[PDB]
């Protein structure tokens, strides 16, 4: 009776926490019944719209590792709630839709669902507001941080891909360019290009933004209820896991400090050479990428990958972590058996991309994954929104193992080698890779001699780690 509209309010709050307001109210007039039959044969359904004249901001906290050093993993999550709540208040001031928030990186768009005639102004003024808010946060909380901002305009095809942990994102080459101009930026200034400056109309303090190492500038200022209940329960188990939902049932916020949890990233390498925008924006290419992400998500419904959590997918990357739910060490279970089953998850998603390429004719997707375990930090960011995410040095080293890997092979760090080798798996010594904070680090690869006669390559000591596409490394290694 009245608990039906209670469940409808909860379902409303879980729709709005993952989708923008226009698309959420479109979903709340129950527009497509086939999507409403999907919440209940050739391609899986997906919704994307190739939208022009947007403005994409990224923004990354500079100096996040030392700022999160001596924290008790509740103080960290609390101050991070404070900073990101200030950013959300800036978003709802400046009329820029935020997209998501991964790690120490926050990123927005400027009027992709609704066309806005001054989207570039909204985007760079929101970046200047971020610089102001982070210096006020540094003064108040006494934490020595600032942030660099990059803004690019262009066309963007935006929507939802995947069906576990799905979320409204954006994808284009313009998003990759906004990412790299965040990466090429200086802290404290918003880093804009010619694509923004051609209609920025120069009412700001522009500079020739030159690199130290392409018409780029710098600005510094101036029984129905059973259906509704199961539907809202699926939307809740969508956006956060179960144990965090139980701990958040009796409290106001969530923050947890795990001492041993594994984590994989999984980047599809050659999706760039499949992408080309020559047909209708390339949304058919993202339909194909949706099919592969949905196959990975169908791996999660297996009865033996119940305790594998999926954090999110970042472009073509796929982040998953384990050992978060296993609070009780059983009587007849190995203490690091979650590492064994997350490694089996990585092996089986290798198998899934092998089975996927049989239906792909005269092209092969390849993915590299990277594996690590250790202590980490779980938490929930928003209130009136929700965002489950993990942090730690372990996640940064796993992103490093993804980025510094060879394709079609599982790269495994040294302590993960030392625990996996006692469970019978065979590895071969890849070499020694520079890891920030660790220095030169001993790495390993999983398939024994899957190349003909070249297992070792230990010469890699590259300092310039600049990624030209959206990967799992964003929000990692400030």
């Amino acid at each position: 009776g009245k608990d039906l509209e209670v469940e409808k309010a909860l379902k409303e709050r879980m729709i709005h926490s993952v989708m923008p307001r226009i698309i959420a109210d479109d979903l709340m007039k129950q527009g497509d019944e086939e999507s409403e039959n999907s919440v209940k044969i050739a391609f899986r359904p997906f919704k994307m719209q190739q939208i022009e004249e947007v403005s994409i901001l990224f923004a990354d906290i500079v100096g996040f590792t030392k700022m999160s050093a001596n924290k008790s993993a509740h103080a960290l999550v609390g101050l991070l709630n404070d900073l990101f709540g200030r950013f959300d208040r800036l978003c709802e001031e400046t009329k820029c839709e935020k997209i998501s928030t991964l790690g120490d990186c926050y990123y927005c768009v400027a009027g992709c669902p609704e066309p806005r005639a001054d989207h570039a102004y909204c985007c760079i003024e929101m970046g200047l507001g971020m610089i102001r808010a982070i210096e006020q946060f540094c003064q108040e909380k006494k934490e020595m941080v600032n942030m660099r901002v990059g803004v690019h305009t262009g066309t963007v095809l935006c929507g939802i891909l995947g069906m576990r942990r799905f979320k409204f994102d954006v994808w284009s080459n313009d998003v990759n360019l906004a990412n790299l101009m965040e990466q090429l930026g200086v802290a404290g200034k918003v880093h804009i290009s010619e694509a923004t400056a051609k209609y920025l109309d120069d009412r700001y303090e522009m500079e020739d933004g030159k690199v130290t190492e392409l018409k780029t500038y710098l600005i510094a200022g101036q029984t129905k209820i059973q259906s509704m209940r199961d539907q809202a329960d699926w939307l809740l188990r969508n956006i956060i896991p179960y144990h965090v939902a139980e701990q958040l049932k009796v409290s106001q916020t969530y923050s947890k400090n795990h001492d041993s949890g594994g984590v994989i990233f999984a980047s599809i390498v050659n999706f760039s050479e499949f992408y080309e925008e020559n047909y209708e924006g390339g949304k058919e290419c993202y339909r194909v990428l949706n099919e592969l992400i949905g196959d990975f998500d169908e791996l999660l419904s297996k009865p033996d990958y119940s305790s594998i959590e999926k954090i999110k997918t970042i472009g073509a990357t796929y982040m998953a972590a384990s050992g978060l739910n296993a609070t009780q060490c059983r009587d007849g279970s190995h203490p690091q058996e979650h590492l064994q089953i997350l490694f089996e998850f990585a092996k089986e998603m290798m198998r899934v991309v092998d089975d996927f390429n049989n239906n792909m004719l005269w092209f092969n997707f390849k993915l590299r994954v990277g594996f690590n375990h250790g202590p980490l930090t779980a938490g929930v960011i928003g209130t009136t929104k929700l965002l489950y995410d993990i942090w730690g040095d372990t996640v940064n080293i796993a992103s490093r193992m993804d980025t510094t890997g060879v394709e079609c092979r599982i790269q495994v760090s040294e302590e993960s080698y030392r625990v996996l080798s006692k469970m019978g798996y065979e590895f071969d010594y890849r070499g020694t890779v520079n890891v920030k904070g660790k220095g030169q680090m001993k790495t390993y690869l999983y398939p024994k001699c899957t190349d003909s006669g070249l297992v070792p390559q230990h010469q890699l000591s590259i300092s310039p780690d600049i990624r030209v596409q959206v990967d799992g490394s964003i929000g990692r290694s400030p």
Binding site: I41, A42, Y279, V288, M360, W362, F363
Partner: protein
């Protein structure tokens, strides 16, 4: 709301994806559809086809394993003129080039090199265009419809053509079929009505341009087995055009090339009892074309579970009347196939 009308007329159309290997006749079928149901760059790339054909024959003279020599050995300066212009971006086509090309094509060692054209990659409009640019050595001639059908331009990318037969909307996807272009095919697999698969039937003795070690018709068989057993096409029927029937006819009536030397099961093959041959047709040609049809129907019969079908037709893309007949038949077929949802 204006999107319900557009959504329903999008439901009303027929998406006709054209697949197949390279040089099989897809773009010629698209050109034939716009002849049936719908200006100097055509002259230019017809001249490019002429130049490409004559230089390919002239180079393949020496590049054969017995080098076929000139029947008149006095044209060696003309051979050297053709080999001199073998690689140049722009070419104004002077009348000297037309005289050298005609004096090549009158020579009979040149034609004896032309007859062994399955041992090197040569285009399927040489014999027509050598005579027809003997016709248009001058400049004030507009090409005919057959001249436009015979021109070969390599398709790369997804091309679309909307035409409307008797108040029914058609929207067909011309795609390139070279091996590096095939990754672009899956962009068209969503909500397509039928697949028109086009096979160069007469290319049983030829090899593909990519590696020069794989038979063209074996490549088409492997490609058909790929797109038939696909996970996103497993409810979509495949109309199977078998193109280039006149070329298959003249290559069987020539008697030089033997299908049993390349596909060895042809010698113990008998023509089917339900064969419907054309008026006045040599049954060795009929045995050949039904052999190729049953080679593809073996693939379409071995799996498919009754979810999707295969409807083989015999067709010649440069003949407009043949395309009118087979497209009326396919029009009734895809009317049924669109009603099948």
């Amino acid at each position: 709301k204006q999107l319900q009308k557009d959504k329903q007329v999008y439901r009303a159309t027929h998406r006709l994806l054209l697949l197949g290997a390279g040089e099989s006749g897809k773009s010629t079928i698209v050109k034939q559809m716009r002849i049936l149901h719908v200006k100097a760059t055509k002259v230019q790339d017809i001249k490019n086809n002429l130049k490409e054909a004559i230089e390919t024959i002239v180079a393949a003279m020496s590049n054969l394993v017995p080098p076929v020599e000139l029947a008149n050995p006095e044209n060696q300066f003309r051979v050297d003129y053709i080999l001199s212009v073998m690689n140049v971006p722009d070419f104004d086509f002077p009348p000297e080039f037309y005289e050298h090309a005609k004096a090549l094509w009158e020579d009979e060692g040149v034609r004896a090199c032309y007859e062994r054209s399955n041992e090197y990659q040569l285009i399927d409009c040489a014999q027509y265009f050598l005579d027809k640019i003997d016709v248009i050595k001058q400049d004030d001639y507009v090409p005919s419809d057959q001249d436009l059908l015979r021109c070969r331009v390599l398709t790369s990318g997804i091309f679309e053509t909307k035409f409307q037969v008797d108040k029914v909307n058609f929207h067909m996807f011309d795609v390139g079929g070279q091996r590096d272009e095939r990754r672009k095919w899956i962009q068209c697999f969503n909500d397509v009505t039928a697949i028109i698969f086009v096979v160069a039937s007469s290319s049983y003795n030829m090899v593909i341009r990519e590696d020069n070690q794989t038979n063209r018709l074996q490549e088409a068989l492997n490609l058909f087995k790929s797109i038939w057993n696909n996970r996103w096409l497993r409810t979509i029927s495949v109309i199977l055009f078998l193109n280039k029937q006149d070329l298959l006819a003249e290559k069987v009536l020539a008697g030089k090339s033997k299908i049993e030397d390349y596909f060895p099961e042809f010698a113990r093959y008998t023509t089917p009892e339900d064969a419907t041959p054309e008026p006045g047709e040599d049954p060795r040609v009929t045995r050949a074309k039904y052999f190729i049809r049953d080679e593809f129907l073996r693939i379409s019969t071995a799996s498919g579970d009754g979810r999707h079908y295969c409807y083989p037709h015999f067709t010649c893309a440069v003949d407009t009347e043949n395309i009118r007949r087979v497209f009326n038949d396919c029009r009734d077929i895809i009317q049924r196939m669109h009603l099948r949802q």
